[PDB]
Design a protein around this nucleic acid. Structure first.
Ligand SMILES: [Mg+2]
Lengths: 513, 36, 319, 226, 434, 62
RNA sequence: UUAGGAAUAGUUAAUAAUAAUUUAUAAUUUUGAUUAGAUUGUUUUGUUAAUGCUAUUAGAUGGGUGUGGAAAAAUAAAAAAAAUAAUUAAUAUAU
């Protein structure tokens, strides 16, 4: 037993609430026990913990236990980027053995904090420090006539499309890759300084050869990897006799500037010359006095090109290099699949006529149908809250705006559209002045983390920045009706995942023959 | 050690402290420390 | 890995490139640039005929050196050549710098030149380190040099295995502009301790001490000990006891010290308000300047024992 | 015990060895008997990089819509054979392509003939199951000339890495019984020109000079330098 | 807080103004509801809103990481906005895991503070009446979960004590009623450096009448009586903190007898000229100001006819002006800061150095600093969310200590500035004159 | 190797494999009513290459 | 051991009886039982002139798994755990 000091009073027996392990398993994505129906299209945020996220948990994050057919969710993983060193064999020593293979992820984070003690200049880190020479050797390949730079940009588009959706009939790939850049330069001719975003393969300057048979390595000495990425990486055929590209699965998200015709700065602004509408009564002081909102850059004015980066042939892993805002436009197939799955589960499990109450969470005996209707209504409220409805050309779909940081992993499924914007800083809006006017006049303190934009027919290529690294993987299999009817997650808590992604889907008669 | 009455040893069983090594701490590498 | 490119081949430039060719066992790529392409071809042939374990490239312009090498190391002759190569050229290394590049300057330059280089490299996105080298050319050949690196801390930690190939003592002074000041302070202390040792041995001859071999053994165990006192004393004994004897020519000269000490008064702030906020520094500078114009500039630093009183000559007459 | 290493010596637990006796240390676990084992991780895992671009088909799937082109079927059979051969050769894969199921021939592992190790198995009987790459093999074990009296089960007969040289004089038909190969000391007279012993008891192989150089460089006796 | 459903997000699907939880959806699904402006209250159990409270505060710090000084001010503004949406109902006794009288099991932070048998039998009723004083069931139909957690911690301070370790020797406990900010481990060390300073400088400086400004829970007042100061008097603008501190001085034995607590804004009254209270002059005036993330950043000048500064700099200039009217000659002021004004606001100049060099009303007699040894919340306002200090901010913070005396009292402290190892200014060497 | 063995719920980190058992490990409790019936009329249709080879045989036989 | 002292039982013995279809005038208890309460014990503590009074923190644990020689198994700064990992010293932990 333990030595305890005797007291003449009663003893306190605490049942004190700890940090719930199920909570950190759901946050880290390593639960493997949550049966959740009503598949939705809202994105999932996962905070990557130390040694808590692997391919085993990420496979269940893609295909949950409810019997899903397709990974129709964008998965944001905070701090999940990994960095791999090149591996080599040792000729000397007692024998032959290969070392050097190691992951720098989860221990060396991006954007180290700068706290120090002594319009206003602050010290910050806006770019990823590990992959910064690797982005530098890509940005210097486009540094400079203008036509040579235009055909360099047209020759480095990934797959000839670069993510852009443009109608092209009776045209080869090498002419289409030039027509897309010609359309971008014709569209960006009216503005004095604008930008566009493309997907780009790694150039020849970023890959150097090593003699030992033939080894290709990156210029910075570091490889941006995702250790929890499932399946096989995308194999890109080299054209120039078709062989494999040595780093074709690693691509770049280039922001290209057009010409036509680590020190943030903060300023506190003032003004010269009903507050809480959610509260019933009036208060002597507001309960929340100030709001904080994310500051994004300006989009130039707008027929108009689509300007949406869609990867229809690969699964996308975005590793951002700067603070970005990604506006995801949902395809019709994902929302149609979620709608038919939710309505199928509602008509199967809830056969009751439901009584038709006023709202879903009303007074009455909470039957199984009422629980299902309440969960479906809360899922619809989550979908309506975290998204917006935009216009198309005629078209309207859900748009999810996602704040992506350097060091994160943004899994984008195939067929999902997204536009990329750059986050410039952080503003503070007081709730008193914002009740009478727009929040642009209610700005109190504004931190500008991006002091970027300078101010020195067709359009000219000015510069090239690497905003994100695009890891392209082979398209993950879509389950059929019989495959999803027999898919049990408890058969995949240990093994069978590499067989799930190598072979098409899962076996229909898996483990019950 | 043996080459090619004191008891001689084998040069492979008793190695002879090879000369490419360097001396880190010798007996002359001390200093006096007075305390009371 | 990272590619390494060494720019500048002179009396001190070539053993750094030789040690980079020796120690890098086909792990870091080597590129060679100089003021002339014939000198770069000559030093590449000299590295090739004695045994090269890694591949090396020869270049005539800085553009391929920027687009190929991530780490650039410069060891040039004078401050004007470094200002021409780093900033004043059209194909400059810093004005055309890549983001993530690391440019190290081993030339003994001013503080404003290092400030402008670090500022324009931070504007381009690269990392500039100033690390002026101190040592002998044969000490550089054997791998012993003193480096005072100023710049970023993580850039200094990335450059430690490269600096350890040709230098044993590599210290981090801190922010850029403080690495180039350490050599100025060190050579100012060298001149001050040399003048102090010369006047101490002059006073030793004045007091009538005949045994100097036991005097330096006393002075080295005292609080007035210095390495320059151990260095100059057997020469200063012959230079004081035989004043008609000319001092012998050495490697380090009076003009070699004065070329670095002429950077310090330009690197220092305004002194004209008080006209002397550094007494013993200018007291040594006047003795070195009186030893320079008298014909003993190329000779040893112990030649100032004959011009101790002449350093008083610009003190009595200028006041 | 029956056979301890260096007798009873317990200054360290490593002086006893990694196993205290050749017999199993508990009676309830007979699988813990000391025997020569085989690296089945590298051997049983065949290279899947030969099946890429090749459409394999399941056994049960005999519907018409899932059938493939006969040229694609033939290249699938060639790729499946190359996948089964890619690591090594099995006993059941070598005996199927031999006359009389290879009865009487000498099978041997790769490391059974190098160094001072000399051991083979004269095959006596093989029972193929329906999966013909597996089964149960039997044979007379010959180690340094001495031979067993009865056929023993060939351990690790399913793991690839086996070799044989087919000799027509050793082939025994299914009508007759495979005779035991003779012990060179007991049955046939000893001849030094026919068989000479590579190793014997109280014999150890001499030190190779490259191993001596490697150990003296690792210990620091020889001046190893880049 | 009583919600107004007409100004909410979805008044048709949710006519009550909030989205009930039912404990089924994930944490990031609730976090997406709160970020869009929808109120969240539990349907059945307190565990559903407790799991939504911890995870949203963890997900918000991952989206807005504390990378510099401007990122902590934005994170504190974002966490104050989101945690106000996480509500709990006013009648929390109708929820399932509030108490179980038969199994003696309950969920919540009251199991960390109280016994199982004591809560489920008698203390669930005493806590029900404890909330009714501050938040009545009539005026409030919902409570913020941060206010519900603070009411459970303040009920612990009402029921049992609160030890101030290592400031008080293990038996002296205070009882802050509600709305009185207690001290964490980081808030203790500026008073731990002061207690060691007062242990050594009492008698060489002859300190007898101490005055403590903005006592709060009274921790700075009780620390002076431990070091031997006979006459201590505390000034606190909170009236309920004054009644509780003088009741704890009776509970803490017979060695806290000359302790006084009055209600005043910053200083005592000093209004009557006929009663003459000016004869009571203090020889040591202590100030331990609070430094919140919203108050350290928005320091600026306001006022036309009475121009005054706001925030932490305006609180210091109130202390730096009126301290001379209450100080005796040969008396000092003691300021206990924690160096967050220079860390969270590094662009603005030093506010304590602005008084010494520019205003020239006080002379720096002594200065000490000590690095932070522990972790926890720093200057926590009670009914708001908890925010522990990150590692990169914790390693640069230092517990400071400023000792200043009057500009007119140079000639008394002149021999203190003449000792070796001291820093006399240029004005006190001209007044010494050998 | 330790990062592979960390992802299981072993208590002593003893290089075992202990899988997690969720609350629903069978398809019938996941909402699936019965076993899926394959369409035997659709899977027994002749593929397109077989139809093209039948057309080529009818062309080359006549 | 109980300030207000009475009944107890999967029950005792025999047995060609593992695994009790039988036999008996069966067994515990007023020399204090069973149950209820308090409850690890222990010339190790304290005191005194004291064979007195007063304290205690070695431990164990019939349904978690018939595995294992032995359940003691859901967690312990060492008890170094099958190649000399290290065996100069001090912090041996925070880190
Ligand atoms: Mg009987």
């Amino acid at each position: 037993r333990m030595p305890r000091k005797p007291t003449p009073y009663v003893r306190k027996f605490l049942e004190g609430c700890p940090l719930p392990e199920t909570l950190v398993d759901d946050i880290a994505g390593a639960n493997l026990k949550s049966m959740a129906p009503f598949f939705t299209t809202a994105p999932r945020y996962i905070v990557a913990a130390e040694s808590r996220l692997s391919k085993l948990f990420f496979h269940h994050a893609l295909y949950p236990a409810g019997g899903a057919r397709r990974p129709c969710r964008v998965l944001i993983v905070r701090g999940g980027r990994s960095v791999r060193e090149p591996s080599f064999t040792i000729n000397t020593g007692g024998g032959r053995g290969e070392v050097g293979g190691g992951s720098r992820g989860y221990r060396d984070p991006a954007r180290r904090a700068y706290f120090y003690a002594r319009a206003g200049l602050v010290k910050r880190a806006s770019v990823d420090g590990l992959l910064s020479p690797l982005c530098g050797v890509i940005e210097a390949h486009f540094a400079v006539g203008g036509e040579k730079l235009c055909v360099t940009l047209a020759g480095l588009l990934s797959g000839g499309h670069g993510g852009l959706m443009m109608d092209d009939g009776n045209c080869a790939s090498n002419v289409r890759a030039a027509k897309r850049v010609a359309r971008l330069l014709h569209d960006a001719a009216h503005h004095l300084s604008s930008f566009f975003y493309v997907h780009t393969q790694l150039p020849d300057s970023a890959l150097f050869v090593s003699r030992p048979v033939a080894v290709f390595r990156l210029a910075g000495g570091l490889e941006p990897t995702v250790h929890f990425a499932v399946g096989a990486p995308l194999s890109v055929l080299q054209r120039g006799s078709t062989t494999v590209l040595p780093f074709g699965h690693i691509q770049c998200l280039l922001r290209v500037r057009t010409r036509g015709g680590n020190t943030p700065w903060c300023n506190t602004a003032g003004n010269d010359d009903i507050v809480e509408p959610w509260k019933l009564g009036v208060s002597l002081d507001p309960k929340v006095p100030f709001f904080m909102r994310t500051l994004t850059e300006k989009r130039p004015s707008f027929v108009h090109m689509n300007h949406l980066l869609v990867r229809n042939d690969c699964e996308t892993y975005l590793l951002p290099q700067r603070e970005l805002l990604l506006s995801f436009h949902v395809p019709e197939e994902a929302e149609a699949m979620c709608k038919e799955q939710n309505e199928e589960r509602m008509r199967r499990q809830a056969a009751l006529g439901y009584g038709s109450p006023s709202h879903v969470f009303a007074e009455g005996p909470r039957t199984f149908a009422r629980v299902l209707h309440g969960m479906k209504a809360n899922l619809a409220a989550v979908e309506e809250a975290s998204s917006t409805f935009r216009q198309g050309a005629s078209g309207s779909s859900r748009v999810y705006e996602v704040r992506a940081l350097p060091g994160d992993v943004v899994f984008v499924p195939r067929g999902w559209k997204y536009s990329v914007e750059r986050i410039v800083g952080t503003a503070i809006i007081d709730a008193v002045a914002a009740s009478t006017a727009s929040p642009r006049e209610a700005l109190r303190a504004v931190f500008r983390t991006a002091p970027d934009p300078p101010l020195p027919s067709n359009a000219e290529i000015v510069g090239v920045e690497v905003d994100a690294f695009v890891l392209c993987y082979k398209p993950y299999p879509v389950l059929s009706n019989a495959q999803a009817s027999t898919y049990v997650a408890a058969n995949y808590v240990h093994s069978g995942i590499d067989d799930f992604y190598a072979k098409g889907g899962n076996d229909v008669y898996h483990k019950y023959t | 050690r043996r080459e090619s009455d004191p008891v001689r040893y084998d040069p492979l069983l008793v190695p002879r402290t090879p000369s490419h090594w360097s001396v880190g701490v010798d007996a002359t590498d001390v200093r006096r420390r007075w305390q009371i | 890995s990272l590619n390494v490119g060494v720019v500048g081949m002179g009396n001190m430039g070539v053993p750094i490139a030789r040690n980079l060719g020796f120690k890098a066992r086909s792990a870091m790529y080597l590129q060679i640039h100089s003021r002339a392409l014939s000198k770069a071809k000559r030093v590449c042939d000299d590295l090739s005929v004695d045994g090269a374990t890694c591949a090396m490239r020869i270049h005539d312009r800085y553009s391929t050196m920027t687009k190929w090498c991530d780490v650039i190391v410069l060891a040039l002759a004078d401050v004007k050549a470094s200002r021409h190569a780093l900033l004043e050229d059209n194909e400059s290394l810093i004005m055309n710098a890549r983001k993530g590049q690391i440019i190290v300057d081993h030339t003994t330059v001013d503080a404003e030149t290092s400030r402008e280089c670090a500022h324009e490299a931070a504007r381009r996105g690269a990392y500039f380190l100033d690390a002026p080298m101190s040592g002998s050319p044969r000490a550089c050949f054997n791998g012993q040099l003193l480096l005072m690196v100023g710049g970023d801390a993580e850039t200094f930690q990335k450059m430690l295995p490269i600096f350890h190939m040709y230098a044993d003592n590599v210290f981090h002074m801190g922010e850029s502009g403080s690495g180039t000041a350490a050599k100025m302070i060190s050579q100012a202390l060298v001149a001050s301790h040399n003048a102090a040792a010369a006047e101490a041995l002059s006073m030793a001859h004045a007091l009538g001490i005949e045994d100097q071999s036991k005097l330096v053994q006393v002075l080295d165990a005292s609080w007035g000990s210095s390495t320059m006192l151990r260095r100059n004393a057997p020469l200063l004994q012959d230079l004081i006891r035989n004043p008609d004897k000319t001092p012998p020519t050495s490697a380090v000269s009076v003009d070699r010290l004065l070329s670095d000490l002429a950077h310090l008064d330009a690197s220092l702030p305004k002194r004209g308000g008080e006209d002397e906020p550094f007494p013993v520094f200018d007291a040594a500078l006047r003795s070195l300047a009186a030893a320079s114009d008298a014909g003993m500039g190329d000779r040893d630093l112990a030649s100032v024992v004959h011009y101790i009183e002449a350093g008083e000559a610009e003190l009595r007459n200028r006041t | 015990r029956a056979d301890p290493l260096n007798g009873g010596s317990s200054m360290t637990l490593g002086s006893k060895g990694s196993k205290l006796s050749p017999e199993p240390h508990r009676r309830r676990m007979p699988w813990t008997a000391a025997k020569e084992y085989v690296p089945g991780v590298v051997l049983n895992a065949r290279d899947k990089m030969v099946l890429d671009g090749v459409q394999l088909l399941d056994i049960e799937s005999i519907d018409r819509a899932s059938q493939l082109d006969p040229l694609e079927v033939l290249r699938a059979v060639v790729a499946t054979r190359e996948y089964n051969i890619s690591t090594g050769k099995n006993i059941f894969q070598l005996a199927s392509q031999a006359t009389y199921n290879g009865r009487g021939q000498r099978f041997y592992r790769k490391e059974w003939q190098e160094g001072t190790y000399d051991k083979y198995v004269t095959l006596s009987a093989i029972d193929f199951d329906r999966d013909g790459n597996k089964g149960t093999a039997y044979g007379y074990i010959t180690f340094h000339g001495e031979t067993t009296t009865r056929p023993v089960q060939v351990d690790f007969a399913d793991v690839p890495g086996w070799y044989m040289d087919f000799v027509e004089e050793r082939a025994v038909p299914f009508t007759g019984i495979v005779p035991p190969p003779p012990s060179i000391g007991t049955d046939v007279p000893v001849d030094p020109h026919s068989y000479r012993l590579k190793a014997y008891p109280y014999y150890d192989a001499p030190n190779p000079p490259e191993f001596v150089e490697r150990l003296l460089k690792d210990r620091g006796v020889l001046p190893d330098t880049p | 807080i009583t919600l107004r459903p007409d100004a909410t997000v979805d008044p048709e699907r949710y006519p009550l103004g909030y989205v009930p939880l039912d404990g089924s959806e994930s944490v990031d699904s609730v976090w997406s509801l709160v970020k869009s402006g929808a109120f969240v209250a539990p349907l059945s159990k307190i565990e559903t809103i407790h799991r939504a409270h911890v995870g949203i505060r963890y997900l918000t710090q991952s989206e807005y990481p504390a990378l510099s000084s401007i990122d902590v001010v934005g994170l504190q503004t974002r966490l104050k906005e989101l945690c106000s949406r996480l509500l709990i109902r006013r009648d929390f006794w109708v929820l399932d895991d509030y108490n179980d009288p038969e199994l003696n099991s309950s969920f919540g932070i009251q199991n960390m503070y109280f016994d199982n048998f004591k809560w489920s039998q008698v203390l669930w009723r005493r806590f029900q009446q404890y909330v009714e004083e501050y938040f009545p069931v009539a005026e409030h139909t919902h409570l913020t979960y941060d206010e519900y957690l603070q009411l459970l911690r303040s009920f612990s301070h009402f029921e049992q004590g609160a030890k101030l370790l290592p400031l008080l020797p293990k038996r002296y406990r205070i009882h802050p009623p509600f709305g009185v900010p207690a001290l964490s481990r980081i808030d203790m060390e500026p008073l731990l450096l002061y207690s060691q300073w007062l242990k050594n400088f009492r008698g060489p400086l002859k300190l007898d009448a101490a005055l403590v400004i903005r006592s709060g829970c009274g921790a700075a007042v009780f620390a002076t009586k431990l070091n031997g100061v006979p006459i201590v008097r505390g000034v606190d603008p909170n009236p309920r903190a004054v009644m509780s501190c003088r009741k704890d001085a009776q509970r803490m034995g017979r060695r806290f007898d000359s302790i006084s607590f009055r209600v005043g804004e910053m200083f005592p009254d000093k209004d009557d000229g006929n009663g003459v209270p000016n004869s009571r002059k203090y020889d040591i005036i202590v100030f331990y100001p609070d430094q919140g993330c919203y108050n350290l950043f928005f320091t600026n000048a306001i006022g036309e006819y009475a121009p005054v500064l706001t925030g932490f700099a305006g609180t210091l200039e109130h202390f730096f002006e009126e301290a001379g009217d209450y100080l005796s000659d040969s008396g000092v002021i003691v300021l206990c800061c924690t160096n967050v004004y220079s860390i969270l606001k590094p662009t603005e100049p030093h506010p304590i150095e602005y008084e010494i060099k520019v205003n020239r009303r006080w002379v720096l007699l002594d200065y000490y600093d000590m690095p932070v040894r522990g972790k926890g919340t720093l200057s926590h306002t009670p009914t708001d969310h908890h925010y522990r200090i990150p590692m990169e901010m914790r390693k640069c913070m230092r517990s400071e200590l400023w000792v200043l005396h009057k500009m007119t009292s140079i000639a008394h402290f002149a021999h203190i500035h003449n000792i070796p190892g001291a820093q006399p200014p240029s004005c006190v060497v001209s007044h010494w004159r050998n | 190797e330790w990062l592979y063995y960390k992802q299981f719920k072993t208590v002593d980190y003893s290089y075992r494999v202990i899988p997690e058992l969720p609350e629903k490990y069978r398809p019938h409790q996941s909402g699936i009513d019965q076993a899926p019936l394959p369409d035997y009329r659709e899977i027994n249709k002749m593929p397109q290459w077989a139809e093209c080879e039948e057309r080529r045989q009818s062309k080359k036989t006549v």
